[PDB]
From Swiss-Prot, chain C:
In the adult, detected in brain, colon, leukocytes, breast and testis. Widely expressed in the fetus. Also expressed in a variety of proliferating cell lines. Its main location: cytoplasm. The gene is PSMG1. This is Proteasome assembly chaperone 1. It comes from Homo sapiens. Keywords: Acetylation, Chaperone, Cytoplasm, Endoplasmic reticulum, Phosphoprotein.
From Swiss-Prot, chain D:
Transmembrane segments: none annotated. This is Proteasome subunit alpha type-7. Changing Y152F: Displays impaired G1/S transition and S/G2 progression. The keyword NAD does not apply. InterPro entries: Ntn_hydrolases_N, Proteasome_alpha, Proteasome_alpha-type, Proteasome_asu_N, Proteasome_sua/b. Glycans are attached at S129.
UniProtKB/Swiss-Prot annotation, chain E:
Belongs to the peptidase T1B family. Keywords: Acetylation, Cytoplasm, Disease variant, Host-virus interaction, Nucleus, Phosphoprotein, Proteasome. The modification Phosphotyrosine is found at Y57. Induction: Up-regulated in fibrolamellar carcinomas. GO terms for molecular function: lipopolysaccharide binding. The chain holds residues 46 to 260 of 264 of the full protein. GO terms for cellular component: ciliary basal body; cytoplasm; cytosol; extracellular exosome; mitochondrion; nucleoplasm; nucleus; proteasome complex. GO terms for biological process: negative regulation of inflammatory response to antigenic stimulus; proteasome-mediated ubiquitin-dependent protein catabolic process. This is Proteasome subunit beta type-4. It comes from Homo sapiens. The 26S proteasome consists of a 20S proteasome core and two 19S regulatory subunits. The 20S proteasome core is a barrel-shaped complex made of 28 subunits that are arranged in four stacked rings. The two outer rings are each formed by seven alpha subunits, and the two inner rings are formed by seven beta subunits. The proteolytic activity is exerted by three beta-subunits PSMB5, PSMB6 and PSMB7. Forms a ternary complex with SMAD1 and OAZ1 before PSMB4 is incorporated into the 20S proteasome. Interacts with PRPF19. (Microbial infection) Interacts with HTLV-1 Tax protein.
From Swiss-Prot, chain H:
Belongs to the peptidase T1B family. It is linked to Neurodevelopmental disorder with microcephaly, hypotonia, and absent language: An autosomal recessive disorder characterized by microcephaly, intellectual disability with absent speech, severe developmental delay, short stature, and hypotonia. Affected individuals also manifest aggressive behavior and have hearing loss. InterPro entries: Ntn_hydrolases_N (IPR029055), Proteasome_bsu_CS (IPR016050), Proteasome_sua/b (IPR001353), Proteasome_suB-type (IPR023333). It comes from Homo sapiens. Transmembrane segments: none annotated. SUPFAM superfamilies: N-terminal nucleophile aminohydrolases (Ntn hydrolases). It is found in: Cytoplasm; Nucleus. The gene is PSMB1. This is Proteasome subunit beta type-1. The modification N6-acetyllysine is found at K176. Glycans are attached at S30, S181. The 26S proteasome consists of a 20S proteasome core and two 19S regulatory subunits. The 20S proteasome core is a barrel-shaped complex made of 28 subunits that are arranged in four stacked rings. The two outer rings are each formed by seven alpha subunits, and the two inner rings are formed by seven beta subunits. The proteolytic activity is exerted by three beta-subunits PSMB5, PSMB6 and PSMB7. Interacts with SERPINB2. Interacts with RFPL4A.
Amino acid sequence: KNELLPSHPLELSEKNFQLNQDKMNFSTLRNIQGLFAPLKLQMEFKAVQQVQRLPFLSSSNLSLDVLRGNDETIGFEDILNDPSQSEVMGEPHLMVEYKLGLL
Amino acid sequence: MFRNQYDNDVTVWSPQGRIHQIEYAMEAVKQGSATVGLKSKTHAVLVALKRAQSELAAHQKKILHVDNHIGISIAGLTADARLLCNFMRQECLDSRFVFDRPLPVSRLVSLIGSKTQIPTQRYGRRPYGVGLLIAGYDDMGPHIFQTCPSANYFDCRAMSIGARSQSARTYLERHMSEFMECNLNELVKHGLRALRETLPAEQDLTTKNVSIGIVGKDLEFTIYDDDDVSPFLEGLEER
Amino acid sequence: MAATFFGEVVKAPCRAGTEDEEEEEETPEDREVRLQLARKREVRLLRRQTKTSLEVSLLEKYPCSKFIIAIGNNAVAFLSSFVMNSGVWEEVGCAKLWNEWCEAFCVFYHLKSNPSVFLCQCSCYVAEDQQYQWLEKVFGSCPRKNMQITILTCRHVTDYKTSESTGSLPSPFLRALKTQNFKDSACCPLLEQPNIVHDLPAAVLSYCQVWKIPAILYLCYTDVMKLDLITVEAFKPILSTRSLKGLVKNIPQSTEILKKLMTTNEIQSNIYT
Amino acid sequence: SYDRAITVFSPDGHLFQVEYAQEAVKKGSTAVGVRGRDIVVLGVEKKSVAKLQDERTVRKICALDDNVCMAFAGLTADARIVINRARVECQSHRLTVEDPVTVEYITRYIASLKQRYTQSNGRRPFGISALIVGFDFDGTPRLYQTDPSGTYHAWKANAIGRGAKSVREFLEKNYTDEAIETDDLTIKLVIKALLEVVQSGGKNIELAVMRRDQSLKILNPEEIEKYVAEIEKEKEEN
Amino acid sequence: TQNPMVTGTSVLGVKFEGGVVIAADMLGSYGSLARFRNISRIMRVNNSTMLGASGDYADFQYLKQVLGQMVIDEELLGDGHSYSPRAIHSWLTRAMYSRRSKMNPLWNTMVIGGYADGESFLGYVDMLGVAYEAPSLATGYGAYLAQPLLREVLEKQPVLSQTEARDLVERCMRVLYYRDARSYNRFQIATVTEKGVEIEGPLSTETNWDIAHMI
Amino acid sequence: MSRGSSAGFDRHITIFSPEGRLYQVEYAFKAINQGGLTSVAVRGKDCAVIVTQKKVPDKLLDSSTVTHLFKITENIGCVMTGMTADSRSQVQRARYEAANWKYKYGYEIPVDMLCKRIADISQVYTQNAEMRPLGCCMILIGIDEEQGPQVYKCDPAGYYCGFKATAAGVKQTESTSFLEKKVKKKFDWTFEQTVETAITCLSTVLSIDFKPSEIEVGVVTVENPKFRILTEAEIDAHLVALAER
Amino acid sequence: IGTGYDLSASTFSPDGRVFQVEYAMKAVENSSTAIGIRCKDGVVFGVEKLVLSKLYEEGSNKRLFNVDRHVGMAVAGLLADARSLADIAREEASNFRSNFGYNIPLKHLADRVAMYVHAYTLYSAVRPFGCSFMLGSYSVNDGAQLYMIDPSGVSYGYWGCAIGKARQAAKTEIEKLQMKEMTCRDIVKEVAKIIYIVHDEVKDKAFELELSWVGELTNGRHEIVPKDIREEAEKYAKESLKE
Amino acid sequence: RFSPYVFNGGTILAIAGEDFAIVASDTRLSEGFSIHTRDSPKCYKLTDKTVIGCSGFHGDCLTLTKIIEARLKMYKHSNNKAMTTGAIAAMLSTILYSRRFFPYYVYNIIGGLDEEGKGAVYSFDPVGSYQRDSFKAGGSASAMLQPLLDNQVGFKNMQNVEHVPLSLDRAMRLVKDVFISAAERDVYTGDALRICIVTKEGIREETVSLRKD
């Protein structure tokens, strides 16, 4: 589909900004610290994200923010558009099944 | 008695310092049928004792193709065996696609070892309860590799795994020097004799229950069944 | 011990089985279904010949002097191969029971020449709550204290406990366990101290010991259990000794051929080839 | 234990959690549906005539599509979820295939959804049994019944919920081609079956009528009482 | 790569009886500027394989790092197997093709020499993935200037000796220096034989300018 | 947790006790005690000193590699008490956090902020079920630009308080009492005075007179803000000064 | 004794002990002894590799791994975990050469692998590694460096150590050996002698001695001891055992 | 800019017969105005009953041949039998259409015996469309070669002629003549002509020298 092609050159970069930042942090740790630090942080993130609200309810992700160092950092991401005020919410069961990988 | 708590899981260490799930996977592979794998200075032969669920049901195949120069002998869980065979086939295809050369047997065995080690360390996964005798030919010559449900692997000149394989192992250890320097037909006959030693005295080898896989210098891995194994059975001495 | 989700609280299972009782410890419907299950599980001893339910115990009805009991497919196969063709054995009685875990039958035989000698080919499993009921149905409450009971069963090498590992152990080995009254030679090494038997052979042997009945229990530990010829070959020493010396005639030839018949007609493991 | 985990098989080979979902279905109110010549009718026995409650908000018979109907017996919330999913799938099928949804297709979809929810132990099975009934593209009457396990079966006449067995025996005894031929005969049959289910009957009868090329319509208590009076007069004549 | 930036001039390779010899200049040009005049555009992959590149020098260094790491790892394995030059050629072809398919190709044209199992190997891998084996090879302006002489000599005498191949390569280097603006006087002769890969030091050409006075 | 939450109140980190205590954190403290060593840190008006007992178990063991004094950044050093592996992991995490702070904010991280980050990570550990608290204790020292010498100890529970004289290890209570007695008597607290106070406190609580090789001393002064590890000769000189007076 | 606290690696005992790590240590102790002695010229390894059957080809289940051109690896405990950790170390050293362009220091590699092991011991989803290994290397600047890593995740340098069944006897032998003044040849001879001394022929039927060393004589490159020198060392060990 | 494709020349041609399937191609690998090498046959044998010719961008040709070999091995492993010529043609069509938006710049002609022992020739376009023909020519000189194949093998525009069945020797002579003409008029052809004859006995390879540039 044409949706795969980014509309803006900056869109692809800022859409995955958090993922790219985590990847860069893992790359730096792994360059300097070693394989243990990225693996440790990956398990920690997986553990914190595994426990949260269901997809149709907005989660706080406080522990994830603390682990990622964003608990005291605010960017345009947090303010410009609120995940709480989604304006678009699907069927609860449908969203849960989508997250589970069934769909 | 006191090991019930540490027996259920694979990520739980026993007070003696031994994971019991791996040993139970070894028991599972032991519970399977018997295979014999031996190699001469120029050939590697895998002879397996196929088992039939019933008289009407056909004997289930135990020799599986992997590459033009690599083959395996099945022993233990069938689903894990098929998964491992698919993984090895994909690895060999990737090697021949990238480097345009056959994948060395030792590298494939190391990859299998790592792959089967991964589950034993993680939660929610069980060890691959399958043992494989891998026969292949490389620049170093014939190879016989024994893969255990525990990720550790062994390099052998002759080995038998499965049920009642102790007699076959004893016979193989009796004539190792004969195995190393002998003709291809002699090597196949030695493997058949070991497999017979596994069998009860009353029973005897038949074309239906014998599967032979041979890989050599100029010979690719070919699996012989029934009328194809009849020539090898002919001329075999009486037990 | 569920661990269905992340925060699921799991509880360590108790080897003593306390948790089952703790959960257990009413509603008329629950009591009714429990009684239905109880009468579904109870052993019903009867004979297919003439369809006459055997309310009276076998021991009370006929006086037995030698009761050979075989539990497990290999043991009943050995008996079928060696003792049937030696003489004549007609069916008298058959216990019928239903278990959660499971040619599953418990058939009793008696020699026409000497009715005092009986037999039991228990190819089916009996739950922990039904061995005592089976003993009540067969032996009744009043024993004879004059019966030579030779219990035959097959076990797995993994069950046997010793310093040597299971693999290193010679797989086709068998042990013996005899009561105080049984003064005859066991012909086999006695079971190791830590080893324990906890099935129908154990129930029968305990019944014999409590009531002073001479009995001997044979346990043939083997790595394979599905109609294996090596198991019966290792059982042969049992008939080589007394008790089963006269029951089986001097015709090993037919038995050896007969033993092959049972092994040929066997079902292999689809999961493990 | 074996009966606590959905994925764990019992030694006998049972998935006892699915059977417990079936028991929950049995706990529900009786729902009865029969099949006739160009006439399909449903009937649900109300557990109690709760005063100060709007009957519209607690209806058991709903219309998945203009040509398909469905009645359930079990947990109401699960039934509502399944009904919404079935309606969404019916519209999606009418979009992608452009043809009216067959009763087989939607019954298969509902059964697949229930089975998928039976798959994992994290998700509990839907504790509902559905009586999907309607007309196909050619207008052939069709009646079907799904179970929490995920097995669907076609029936000439079926009853689900509490007292399902007795109503099923009633229907088997009193199912004739003549009754199917007349739409009023089928309606009277359903009224008699539900009256056998519940002695009081009357206001407790929740009956819906669907005919050839006609949308689902629920008979008002007036018509239900008229049919009950007809049945009573017929019984008195005998 | 999108901007070649520092580039290589040309690599010429020819196979003789006993091994293969390749040659390349020691110049990396930014544009028309010489800039870096001491870099080496030839690497020793292993004891029986050599490699020379023409194009982006950063990509050449990246390939150097990757190939050295693979060789080191395989040596660590210590299973008695060695990457044959044909295997390295196939791997390089696959890598270049994948990079091309990703629309981010490596801008180097690679010449692969080697001598294993008594067989001289001489491979060519291009930017896009065009791979082939020829008795003589030449990249960049080599294919136009030196390749004629190499092909003529080889089609005249199918098999050359080490000295003959070296002399022919030196003549080709002289011609390239005469008639290539991106060439450099200093070059590097690398030869692989049964003994192993031997890379000679910086060598200069015998310039001749009598025609300057002739006019 | 992937394996599953434990049953008993004290068998899991997350679930509370009837009072509301978390027994796993207390067991982490018991692990810190199980470390086997004692660390004493003293804050003066000119320098901060950390002293811990160095116990090379075997002669074959290389004494150079056996050390509990680690530097987080060029100006901040720490002494770790408890499990060795957990202490190393916390040291690596603190180093990474300090480097990230320097990269992002343009100036070196203060000690208080370093322990605040470490304690936040520790709280995250104590709140979730998958992970467990680290069985170790971190004592950070460093000279602040305005506040002067700073000593902060940094625990599994997530308490990041700062102290004038910190103690940690098996003899934490006795060392704390001794340091409280010394602090109540306010001396000049010079560099050598602080070193002597730390060494004599450790000797008193351990009831042993240290030789140069039985302790490792790390210091950081206002004049020299770089974290410095005292050479064995300097430790011997300090011990000789203590013995003389 | 941690009866109800020894099921998960994320559970603390009342006294503060993680019993899963200790069980991993015991599992390491179940394995045959592997010793390694560091001297002035370099580091020499040696393992009592028991042969389970004569069928196995010589060199099967090798306990000595070359994780890098200059770094050796003598492993004990579970073999599968040993191979996995060897692969991890290989990736780390490969990555260091690729990034910083020079061979990774022995201390840094030991720290990386030890922290990997500790991370594995941290969580309950995974179990602690059941193997202990020795990392040894020699360099002209760094010099002879020998390190040992425990399943807990420690990393301590040694002049000589042993891991396995007869750990203490080998440790005492190394203690009474003066490694700091001997060359690599004498060190390998003494390693063979110690391995033969600590081997119990009664419980263990037979074993094959694998010897590897890294030092100046090898130009700072880990390699297996040549067959001639290995045979000489075995002969010397036989003579020492006889007397 | 960057151009992922370049034209390396090469001409392929396949002729089907009653019991033979000739697959012929030239050995000229030429990029731009230069000749990369004079020995690079464009025909690669897949099985004992199938030979495929690839012309166009050399890198795509090599990658496609390697993928075809890998897929043949996968099919043999899965179905325990060698893939038939029609199956190979269908699989190649699917593979070619897989990379539709980044098309392979390869002209593919599959020639070999079918299950009935009859020569089968399948012609492919870069996108993937294919059909079975009795004879086809592909590559740079396809337009030059095709008319004579139509005139002789197809007997088109030949009034009052005998439709003699195509023999093997006549097919070889025709192939040699057409490739000689191509070398004469096409600069991308010459050097040598690799002829692969697929018969029930096996595959025979014949090399015929063509005039160099």
